[PDB]
Design a protein around this ligand. Sequence first.
Ligand SMILES: COc1ccc(Cc2nccc3cc(OC)c(OC)cc23)cc1OC
Ligand SMILES: COc1ccc(Cc2nccc3cc(OC)c(OC)cc23)cc1OC
Lengths: 142, 142
Amino acid sequence: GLVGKLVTQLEVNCDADIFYKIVKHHPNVIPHFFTGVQVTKGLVSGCIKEWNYVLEGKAMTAVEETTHADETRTLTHHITEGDAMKDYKKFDVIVETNPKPHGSVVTYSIVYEKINEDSPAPFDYLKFFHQNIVDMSAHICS
Amino acid sequence: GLVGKLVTQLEVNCDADIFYKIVKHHPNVIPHFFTGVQVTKGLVSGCIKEWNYVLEGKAMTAVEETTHADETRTLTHHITEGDAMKDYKKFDVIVETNPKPHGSVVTYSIVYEKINEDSPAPFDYLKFFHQNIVDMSAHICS
Ligand SMILES: COc1ccc(Cc2nccc3cc(OC)c(OC)cc23)cc1OC
Ligand SMILES: COc1ccc(Cc2nccc3cc(OC)c(OC)cc23)cc1OC
């Protein structure tokens, strides 16, 4: 099948709702910048960004639309164009934060559909997003 | 947190129960061998294997105990010793096969606890297990 999902899940010592608000509004362990716009539904609900970035040494671009759901503490990043779309027909990244039954569990999911069987699965992106949330989490404390 | 999980999930065009039986009883895109024993509860329920294998060029060993649950089509591989335990206090690999709401969805989950913050997350194992189930799946058809 061309269809799959990669996940990295990490425990964080931080209340879920506060951690979601931190991630929602938040650096450069990678060369990167973006231009773009915010989206409203007159309050900002999301954004559309064109990113320029370097992954594993290679410069790339991507157009990303981000939406959020405060009730479920979920952020959704929907990629519509760029280098990744040479490999994937569909590429979405869903970030979920839930309390432990303390602190919380953060899940990054990359939901993808390959263009064909020769396409790689997005382990490079999984590692990138993983190291990004590890770094962010290591700059927060009690 | 030192605690996390990595997942790779793939769709396969194959009934779930049959695919589980295939995985349960099943090669060498990696240098590897094992010695070990089978476990009974007088019917074999599992196995305990000492593996010798090469991952990303480096020879390694691991002691693995495998159990299965036919009712949930789940295989559990519990690592008790070897090279990975220099990095992880706990390392388990859970393989689940479920029908799509056709064919099925296979999930490999690596549930880990790092020894300390300097330990890597097991992306190397995730890619290995991923490429192994992709290869196996590509030798099955209608
Ligand atoms: C091709 O895949 C992507 C490429 C870039 C992004 C951009 C992005 N979104 C959220 C957080 C990010 C965090 C980043 O690091 C700070 C970053 O640098 C490239 C890009 C980020 C998202 C992507 O997937 C949603
Ligand atoms: C350190 O982690 C492991 C190392 C080796 C294994 C051994 C193993 N179990 C199941 C399927 C396997 C499939 C393999 O490839 C055919 C293989 O080669 C190293 C080892 C396998 C399992 C492991 O985790 C469960």
